[PDB]
Design a protein around this ligand. Structure first.
Ligand code: NI
Length: 187
């Protein structure tokens, strides 16, 4: 964690120019990562949603939680990334691929906020890993990720760009559940 520059902080809140977006390498996401979904399911994220619903007079607790329930849903409990390989862990079963970088795509949301998807492709015919994956983590140039959202599929990169409601979400495996909540409480 270098401190964020001025550009980097605005970019994290979805305000950036296209010309400042730069390519990134898979190693920005090296590490071992826990899905946050079990934390939602156990009620451990509720203080996140309590705070959010309190601050937002247009949304109820149930509106906030449901939106994140839909967003975080996945049975990939863990992801490991190392030496250009991403490993996916579902109930006792592991798949992995040496992913190739395919560039990024800039998306503009209805709010007018912006974000960048970083696209990779698995070209390994033996692999059972998703053929396409996209990383989104409020960062628009090389920098070690502190948490990320990942889109996974076997159909097309465009199909994943169209996705807006499910975005399995990963924080460092080493963080306690309390620390995830505190991170969520802020950023
Ligand atoms: Ni995020």
């Amino acid at each position: 964690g270098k401190p964020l520059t001025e550009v980097e902080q605005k970019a994290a809140n979805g305000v950036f120019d296209d010309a400042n977006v730069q390519n990134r390498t898979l190693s920005d996401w090296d590490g071992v990562w826990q899905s946050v979904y079990p934390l939602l399911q156990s009620g451990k994220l509720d203080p996140v949603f309590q705070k959010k619903a309190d601050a937002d007079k247009t949304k109820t607790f149930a509106e906030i939680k449901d939106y994140y329930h839909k967003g975080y849903a996945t049975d990939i409990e863990m992801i490991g990334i190392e030496d250009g390989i991403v490993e996916f862990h579902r109930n006792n079963e592991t798949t992995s691929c040496k992913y190739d970088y395919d560039g990024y795509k800039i998306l503009t949301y209805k709010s007018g906020k912006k974000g960048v998807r970083y696209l990779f492709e698995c070209k390994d015919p033996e692999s059972k890993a998703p053929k396409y994956i996209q990383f989104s983590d409020h960062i628009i140039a090389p920098r070690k990720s502190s948490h990320f959202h990942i889109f996974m599929g076997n159909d097309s990169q465009q199909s994943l760009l169209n996705e807006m409601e499910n975005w399995p979400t990963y924080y460092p495996y080493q963080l306690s559940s309390e620390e995830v909540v505190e991170e969520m409480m802020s950023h």
